[PDB]
From Swiss-Prot, chain A:
It comes from the Eukaryota. It is found in: Cytoplasm. The chain holds residues 340 to 387 of 387 of the full protein. Belongs to the universal ribosomal protein uL3 family. The gene is RPL3. Disruption phenotype: A mutant confers resistance to trichodermin, a trichotecene toxin produced by plant-pathogenic fungi. This is Large ribosomal subunit protein uL3. Present with 450 molecules/cell in log phase SD medium.
Swiss-Prot record, chain B:
It holds the Pfam family Ribosomal_L31e. There are 2 genes for eL31 in yeast. Component of the large ribosomal subunit (LSU). Mature yeast ribosomes consist of a small (40S) and a large (60S) subunit. The 40S small subunit contains 1 molecule of ribosomal RNA (18S rRNA) and 33 different proteins (encoded by 57 genes). The large 60S subunit contains 3 rRNA molecules (25S, 5.8S and 5S rRNA) and 46 different proteins (encoded by 81 genes). One of its GO terms (biological process) is regulation of translational fidelity. Keywords: Cytoplasm, Ribonucleoprotein, Ribosomal protein. It comes from Saccharomyces cerevisiae (strain ATCC 204508 / S288c). This is Large ribosomal subunit protein eL31A. GO terms for cellular component: cytosol; cytosolic large ribosomal subunit.
Length: 48, 109
RNA sequence: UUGGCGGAAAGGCCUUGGGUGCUUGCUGGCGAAUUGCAAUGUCAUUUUGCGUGGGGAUAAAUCAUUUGUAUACGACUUAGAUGUACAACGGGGUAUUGUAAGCAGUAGAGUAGCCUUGUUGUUACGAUCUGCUGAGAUUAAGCCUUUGUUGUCUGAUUUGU
RNA sequence: GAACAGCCUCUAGUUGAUAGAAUAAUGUAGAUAAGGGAAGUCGGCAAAAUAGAUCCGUAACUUCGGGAUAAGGAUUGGCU
């Protein structure tokens, strides 16, 4: 916890997120979900 | 009569040689196999079949195969045995592709 | 022995009860001497023994192996005596590349043959092109997933108030 | 390929040079780099930059011989 209290207009600012990134960090990720991946790519050959 | 098991393995040499100097690629691949056989068979004495050294060195000092399907046999030395009671013999496996395979115990007949 | 109090470094203070000595508060008996005329003339602990005996609960570190959140070496962070374990391979995921080999094609600039008489003949050569094929290949070596397969699981040394 | 250039190979000859371990800093040798482009530096030192061939085109000046590959531009593969 913070050792002090400050306003600074940067501490009391309420943060409501709009979206969180979940693309792979192992490369230049294009999809944020395996379902979104399957929808963009269509059926693959491995999709037996 | 125990500890005479022979198995067949695939060693991922691509993983082990990652970043290795090109002139030490094949020479270290031989050392990795002896290290690999020691891990699985518990033997410091590891012998390589001359045919296996050919497979490691087939594409030159630097082009070591990514996977080698190999057979490692734990056998006994004889004729005024040395300090090690067991040694592991590694010989190559003639296979179309070394990919997708599992380690299997192969009978010594 | 019973009650407490004391954290600043308390580790010591006060205690109610019994026993047990002493008591120079007062009065006695006996002793001491030759340490020779002084000689500090010797009076209060730490630690040890196949010490004595009354008790007391029967561990870890280090090497080696392993790890990469660490690292010149040392050092560090981890794991490791039957597990929701560890390892090796695979299986999936995730990423990189860019469509594998092979086989076909009435594709193809054209070209040389022969004509069982040309929609959609034909035997050959031909960079390429199309299809099977966002395929194939690689993927932790410091990626994720430890279930499918195969293994491993009591080696060395030192440490005591 | 223009070529006893470079590169690869045959005959022949060697496989010699202390080695083993993951290779920290600093090095030595070899490299790459966003945007800028010599602002660096005594100084473009070092490095980089279209380099072969074919076609085109080529200024000042000149001792008329040159300058000249001046400058500058285009093409280059494979196949039939």
């Amino acid at each position: 916890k913070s050792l002090y209290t400050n306003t600074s207009r940067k501490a009391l600012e309420e943060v409501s997120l709009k979206w969180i990134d979940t693309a792979s960090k192992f490369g230049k990720g294009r999809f944020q979900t395996p379902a979104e991946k399957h929808a963009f790519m269509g059926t693959l050959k491995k999709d037996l | 009569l125990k500890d005479v098991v022979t198995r067949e393995y695939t060693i991922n040499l691509h993983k082990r040689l990652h970043g290795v100097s090109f002139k030490k690629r094949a020479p270290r691949a031989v050392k990795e196999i002896k290290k690999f056989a020691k891990l699985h068979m518990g033997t410091d004495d590891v012998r390589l079949a001359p045919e296996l050294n050919q497979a490691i060195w087939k594409r030159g000092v630097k082009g070591v195969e990514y996977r080698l399907r190999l057979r490692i046999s734990r056998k006994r030395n004889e004729e005024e045995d040395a300090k090690n009671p067991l040694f592991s013999y590694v010989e190559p496996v003639l296979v179309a592709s070394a990919k997708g395979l599992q380690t299997v115990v192969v009978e010594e007949d």
